């Protein structure tokens, strides 16, 4: 499972997710600090500036250092942030 | 990085207009606790209170922001003294309009009190009783002359009538109408409005008068 005794991320939890498969609006990315728990990204707010490209050789399987905006402990939806990130390198 | 709870350290000071205002207690200010570890008497008695007349008089107007230096804080009561009245922006730029002669008068005039005041004014023209001109002007000679009477009566009434009586003239513009009336043989002058009052000198010797201002 995970070595965290806690099950879920918290509010503004900077988490390391796993980019499994890219989906319609974004990608259902799964945490690995907490076990395998799915989170989501864009449409709303992950990017900050506009240069209009995403990948050249970046194939699959990435990891995103993202910050939990919303977490659904019952329903199972973890909204993630990088637009807020000035310091969370 | 650093926040505090300074609202365990502020004290409430009843901001007092003088008793020539029918509302004396204007309001209350949580001033940080004046003490040895935290001196705030300069941000207590150096407080200039910029308040409009509506909470000062009880309401002829709700413009005309008086500045109020607090000559003495007397036991959680900011017994203020007058500093400078205004005619604030919405009231001030309403009268400013094209196709009129904008007439102005800046004076720097000592009170009968120890206070040097500045008084800047504004004035405007009318479209008269039968006037078919779109605008309202005259010769520049009349423009200069109206300003001379406007400075004259303004220096006169503030040299007389010590500071609180300057406060007790100029809310319906006691200087105002006589500049219109004396010029009415030349130009009846639909506007005279003194707008920028700036206290140029402020000695504290009128603490008994501050008790005569208040109470």
């Amino acid at each position: 499972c995970r070595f965290y005794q806690h099950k879920f991320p918290e509010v503004e939890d900077v988490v390391m997710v796993n980019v499994r498969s890219i989906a319609e609006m974004g990608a259902y990315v799964s945490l690995l600090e907490y076990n395998n728990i799915e989170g989501m990204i864009l449409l709303s707010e992950l990017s900050r500036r506009r240069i209009r490209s995403i990948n050249k050789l970046i194939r699959i399987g990435r990891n995103e250092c993202v910050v939990v905006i919303r977490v659904d402990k019952e329903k199972g939806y973890i909204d993630l942030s990088k637009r807020r990130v000035s310091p969370e390198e | 990085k650093k926040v505090v709870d300074p609202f365990s350290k502020k004290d409430w000071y009843d901001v007092k207009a003088p008793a020539m205002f029918n509302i004396r207690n204007i309001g209350k200010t949580l001033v940080t606790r004046t003490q040895g570890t935290k001196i705030a008497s300069d941000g207590l008695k150096g407080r200039v209170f910029e308040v409009s007349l509506a909470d000062l008089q009880n309401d002829e107007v709700a413009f005309r922001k008086f500045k109020l230096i607090t000559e003495d804080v007397q036991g959680k009561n900011c017994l203020t003294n007058f500093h400078g009245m205004d005619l604030t922006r919405d009231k001030m730029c309403s009268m400013v309009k094209k196709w009129q002669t904008m007439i102005e008068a800046h004076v720097d005039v000592k009170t009968t009190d120890g206070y040097l005041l500045h008084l800047f004014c504004v004035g405007f023209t009318k479209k008269c009783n039968n006037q078919i001109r779109k605008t309202s002007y005259a010769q520049h000679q009349q423009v200069r002359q109206i300003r001379k009477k406007m400075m004259e009566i303004m220096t006169r009434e503030v040299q007389t009538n010590d500071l609180k009586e300057v406060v007790n003239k100029l809310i319906p513009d006691s200087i105002g109408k006589d500049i219109e009336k004396a010029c009415q043989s030349i130009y009846p002058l639909h506007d005279v409005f003194v707008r920028k009052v700036k206290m140029l000198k402020k000695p504290k010797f009128e603490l008994g008068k501050l008790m005569e201002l208040h109470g």
């Binding site: - | 509506a54 709700a62 922006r89 919405d90 730029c93 309403s94 400013v96 094209k98």
Partner: protein
């Protein structure tokens, strides 16, 4: 030829005038060759007045007005359509549209 007769606005009775920037582009244009604009507008505009005037208590005082005199350069008057392309027969017209 003169594509405009007054060339934005005339400078007759004046040999030379003072210039002005654009209020939204800071571009140097003369005073009587630019597009001026007065704005008399509430400070309490109709988005807030349905909630301000209800919470405006001890307030029998009327709604205040903001007084702004705008001055555009011609380049940012046209693309923003402060002024815009009219016909040359309409270009004779010295008429501002009403407010």
């Amino acid at each position: 030829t003169k594509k405009r007769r007054n060339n934005g606005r005339a400078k007759k009775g004046r040999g030379h005038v003072q210039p002005i920037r654009c209020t939204n582009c800071a571009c140097c244009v003369p005073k009587d060759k630019a597009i001026k604009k007065f704005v008399i507008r509430n400070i309490v505009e109709a988005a807030a007045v349905r909630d301000i005037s209800e919470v405006s208590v001890f307030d029998a005082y009327v709604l205040p007005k903001l007084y702004v005199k705008l001055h555009y350069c011609v380049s940012c008057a046209i693309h923003s359509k402060v002024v815009r392309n009219r016909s040359r027969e309409a270009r004779k017209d010295r008429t501002p549209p009403p407010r």
